[PDB]
Amino acid sequence: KWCFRVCYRGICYRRCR
């Protein structure tokens, strides 16, 4: 549940904003 854990702790979600 960090900045967006893009490609981690969930999945690939390029969008840290």
Side-chain angles (χ1 to χ4, degrees):
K1 41 69 173 143
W2 317 98
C3 173
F4 241 40
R5 28 81 216 162
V6 298
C7 297
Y8 179 70
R9 270 275 253 192
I11 29 129
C12 269
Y13 210 107
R14 306 132 47 75
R15 252 258 152 198
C16 229
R17 208 275 275 96

mmCIF file of all heavy atoms in Angstrom:
data_model
loop_
_atom_site.group_PDB
_atom_site.id
_atom_site.type_symbol
_atom_site.label_atom_id
_atom_site.label_comp_id
_atom_site.label_asym_id
_atom_site.label_seq_id
_atom_site.Cartn_x
_atom_site.Cartn_y
_atom_site.Cartn_z
ATOM 1 N N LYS A 1 0.840 -1.228 0.000
ATOM 2 C CA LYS A 1 0.000 0.000 0.000
ATOM 3 C C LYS A 1 0.862 1.260 0.000
ATOM 4 O O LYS A 1 0.502 2.270 0.605
ATOM 5 C CB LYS A 1 -0.904 -0.022 1.235
ATOM 6 C CG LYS A 1 -0.208 -0.511 2.496
ATOM 7 C CD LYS A 1 0.836 0.483 2.978
ATOM 8 C CE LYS A 1 1.402 0.085 4.332
ATOM 9 N NZ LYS A 1 2.853 0.397 4.440
ATOM 10 N N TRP A 2 1.997 1.191 -0.685
ATOM 11 C CA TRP A 2 2.912 2.325 -0.770
ATOM 12 C C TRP A 2 2.476 3.286 -1.879
ATOM 13 O O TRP A 2 1.301 3.333 -2.239
ATOM 14 C CB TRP A 2 4.341 1.833 -1.022
ATOM 15 C CG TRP A 2 4.718 0.637 -0.199
ATOM 16 C CD1 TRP A 2 4.705 -0.668 -0.598
ATOM 17 C CD2 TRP A 2 5.161 0.637 1.162
ATOM 18 N NE1 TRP A 2 5.115 -1.480 0.431
ATOM 19 C CE2 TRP A 2 5.400 -0.703 1.522
ATOM 20 C CE3 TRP A 2 5.381 1.640 2.111
ATOM 21 C CZ2 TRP A 2 5.847 -1.064 2.790
ATOM 22 C CZ3 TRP A 2 5.824 1.279 3.371
ATOM 23 C CH2 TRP A 2 6.054 -0.063 3.700
ATOM 24 N N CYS A 3 3.429 4.050 -2.419
ATOM 25 C CA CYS A 3 3.141 5.004 -3.489
ATOM 26 C C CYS A 3 2.245 4.380 -4.557
ATOM 27 O O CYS A 3 1.460 5.072 -5.205
ATOM 28 C CB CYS A 3 4.451 5.494 -4.119
ATOM 29 S SG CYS A 3 4.234 6.528 -5.604
ATOM 30 N N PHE A 4 2.367 3.065 -4.731
ATOM 31 C CA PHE A 4 1.565 2.337 -5.716
ATOM 32 C C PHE A 4 2.067 0.901 -5.914
ATOM 33 O O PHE A 4 1.460 0.133 -6.660
ATOM 34 C CB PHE A 4 1.563 3.072 -7.063
ATOM 35 C CG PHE A 4 0.195 3.497 -7.517
ATOM 36 C CD1 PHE A 4 -0.731 3.994 -6.612
ATOM 37 C CD2 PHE A 4 -0.167 3.402 -8.851
ATOM 38 C CE1 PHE A 4 -1.989 4.386 -7.028
ATOM 39 C CE2 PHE A 4 -1.423 3.793 -9.274
ATOM 40 C CZ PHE A 4 -2.335 4.286 -8.361
ATOM 41 N N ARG A 5 3.173 0.545 -5.250
ATOM 42 C CA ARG A 5 3.754 -0.797 -5.361
ATOM 43 C C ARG A 5 3.651 -1.329 -6.788
ATOM 44 O O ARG A 5 3.312 -2.492 -7.009
ATOM 45 C CB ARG A 5 3.087 -1.776 -4.382
ATOM 46 C CG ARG A 5 1.645 -1.437 -4.026
ATOM 47 C CD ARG A 5 0.679 -1.914 -5.097
ATOM 48 N NE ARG A 5 -0.437 -0.988 -5.279
ATOM 49 C CZ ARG A 5 -1.222 -0.976 -6.353
ATOM 50 N NH1 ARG A 5 -1.022 -1.836 -7.343
ATOM 51 N NH2 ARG A 5 -2.215 -0.099 -6.438
ATOM 52 N N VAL A 6 3.947 -0.464 -7.752
ATOM 53 C CA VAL A 6 3.890 -0.832 -9.161
ATOM 54 C C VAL A 6 4.697 -2.098 -9.434
ATOM 55 O O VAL A 6 5.903 -2.143 -9.195
ATOM 56 C CB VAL A 6 4.412 0.305 -10.055
ATOM 57 C CG1 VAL A 6 3.550 1.547 -9.888
ATOM 58 C CG2 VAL A 6 5.868 0.613 -9.741
ATOM 59 N N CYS A 7 4.014 -3.127 -9.927
ATOM 60 C CA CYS A 7 4.653 -4.404 -10.227
ATOM 61 C C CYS A 7 5.136 -5.062 -8.940
ATOM 62 O O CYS A 7 6.230 -5.623 -8.886
ATOM 63 C CB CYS A 7 5.819 -4.216 -11.200
ATOM 64 S SG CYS A 7 5.329 -3.583 -12.839
ATOM 65 N N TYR A 8 4.308 -4.975 -7.906
ATOM 66 C CA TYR A 8 4.635 -5.547 -6.608
ATOM 67 C C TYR A 8 3.456 -5.399 -5.651
ATOM 68 O O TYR A 8 2.510 -4.659 -5.933
ATOM 69 C CB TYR A 8 5.874 -4.856 -6.031
ATOM 70 C CG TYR A 8 6.288 -5.369 -4.671
ATOM 71 C CD1 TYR A 8 6.829 -6.640 -4.521
ATOM 72 C CD2 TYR A 8 6.138 -4.583 -3.537
ATOM 73 C CE1 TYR A 8 7.209 -7.112 -3.279
ATOM 74 C CE2 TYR A 8 6.514 -5.047 -2.290
ATOM 75 C CZ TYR A 8 7.048 -6.311 -2.167
ATOM 76 O OH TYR A 8 7.423 -6.778 -0.928
ATOM 77 N N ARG A 9 3.517 -6.110 -4.522
ATOM 78 C CA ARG A 9 2.459 -6.070 -3.508
ATOM 79 C C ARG A 9 1.078 -5.924 -4.140
ATOM 80 O O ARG A 9 0.208 -5.237 -3.606
ATOM 81 C CB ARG A 9 2.710 -4.919 -2.530
ATOM 82 C CG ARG A 9 3.564 -5.311 -1.334
ATOM 83 C CD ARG A 9 2.725 -5.933 -0.228
ATOM 84 N NE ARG A 9 2.561 -5.028 0.909
ATOM 85 C CZ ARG A 9 2.076 -5.403 2.090
ATOM 86 N NH1 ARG A 9 1.708 -6.663 2.293
ATOM 87 N NH2 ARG A 9 1.959 -4.518 3.070
ATOM 88 N N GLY A 10 0.889 -6.573 -5.281
ATOM 89 C CA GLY A 10 -0.385 -6.502 -5.967
ATOM 90 C C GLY A 10 -0.277 -6.844 -7.440
ATOM 91 O O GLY A 10 -0.816 -7.856 -7.884
ATOM 92 N N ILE A 11 0.418 -5.995 -8.198
ATOM 93 C CA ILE A 11 0.589 -6.209 -9.639
ATOM 94 C C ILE A 11 1.268 -5.012 -10.298
ATOM 95 O O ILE A 11 1.606 -4.034 -9.634
ATOM 96 C CB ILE A 11 -0.759 -6.457 -10.363
ATOM 97 C CG1 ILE A 11 -1.915 -5.756 -9.639
ATOM 98 C CG2 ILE A 11 -1.030 -7.949 -10.498
ATOM 99 C CD1 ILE A 11 -2.763 -4.892 -10.549
ATOM 100 N N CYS A 12 1.447 -5.096 -11.615
ATOM 101 C CA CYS A 12 2.069 -4.018 -12.375
ATOM 102 C C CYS A 12 1.075 -2.882 -12.592
ATOM 103 O O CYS A 12 0.103 -3.029 -13.333
ATOM 104 C CB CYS A 12 2.582 -4.536 -13.720
ATOM 105 S SG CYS A 12 4.307 -5.125 -13.676
ATOM 106 N N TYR A 13 1.314 -1.756 -11.928
ATOM 107 C CA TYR A 13 0.427 -0.604 -12.036
ATOM 108 C C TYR A 13 1.213 0.698 -12.156
ATOM 109 O O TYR A 13 1.199 1.527 -11.247
ATOM 110 C CB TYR A 13 -0.491 -0.547 -10.815
ATOM 111 C CG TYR A 13 -1.841 0.067 -11.098
ATOM 112 C CD1 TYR A 13 -2.981 -0.722 -11.170
ATOM 113 C CD2 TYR A 13 -1.977 1.435 -11.290
ATOM 114 C CE1 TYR A 13 -4.219 -0.168 -11.425
ATOM 115 C CE2 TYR A 13 -3.213 2.000 -11.544
ATOM 116 C CZ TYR A 13 -4.330 1.194 -11.612
ATOM 117 O OH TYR A 13 -5.562 1.752 -11.867
ATOM 118 N N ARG A 14 1.891 0.879 -13.286
ATOM 119 C CA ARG A 14 2.678 2.088 -13.520
ATOM 120 C C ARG A 14 1.818 3.340 -13.363
ATOM 121 O O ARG A 14 1.108 3.735 -14.287
ATOM 122 C CB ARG A 14 3.297 2.054 -14.919
ATOM 123 C CG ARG A 14 4.106 0.797 -15.197
ATOM 124 C CD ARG A 14 3.741 0.179 -16.537
ATOM 125 N NE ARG A 14 3.696 1.173 -17.606
ATOM 126 C CZ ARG A 14 4.779 1.716 -18.157
ATOM 127 N NH1 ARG A 14 5.990 1.361 -17.746
ATOM 128 N NH2 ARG A 14 4.651 2.617 -19.122
ATOM 129 N N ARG A 15 1.887 3.962 -12.188
ATOM 130 C CA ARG A 15 1.114 5.169 -11.913
ATOM 131 C C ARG A 15 1.360 5.667 -10.489
ATOM 132 O O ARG A 15 0.420 5.928 -9.738
ATOM 133 C CB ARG A 15 -0.379 4.904 -12.129
ATOM 134 C CG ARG A 15 -0.943 5.575 -13.372
ATOM 135 C CD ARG A 15 -1.722 6.834 -13.021
ATOM 136 N NE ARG A 15 -1.709 7.808 -14.109
ATOM 137 C CZ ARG A 15 -2.002 9.097 -13.954
ATOM 138 N NH1 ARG A 15 -2.332 9.570 -12.759
ATOM 139 N NH2 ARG A 15 -1.966 9.915 -14.996
ATOM 140 N N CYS A 16 2.630 5.800 -10.123
ATOM 141 C CA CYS A 16 2.995 6.269 -8.788
ATOM 142 C C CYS A 16 2.467 7.680 -8.540
ATOM 143 O O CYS A 16 2.319 8.103 -7.393
ATOM 144 C CB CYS A 16 4.516 6.239 -8.614
ATOM 145 S SG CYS A 16 5.071 5.420 -7.084
ATOM 146 N N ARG A 17 2.186 8.403 -9.619
ATOM 147 C CA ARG A 17 1.676 9.767 -9.520
ATOM 148 C C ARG A 17 2.714 10.691 -8.894
ATOM 149 O O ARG A 17 2.813 11.854 -9.336
ATOM 150 C CB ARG A 17 0.386 9.797 -8.696
ATOM 151 C CG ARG A 17 -0.547 10.938 -9.065
ATOM 152 C CD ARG A 17 -0.177 12.224 -8.341
ATOM 153 N NE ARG A 17 -0.777 12.295 -7.009
ATOM 154 C CZ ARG A 17 -0.156 11.933 -5.887
ATOM 155 N NH1 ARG A 17 1.089 11.471 -5.923
ATOM 156 N NH2 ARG A 17 -0.782 12.035 -4.723
#
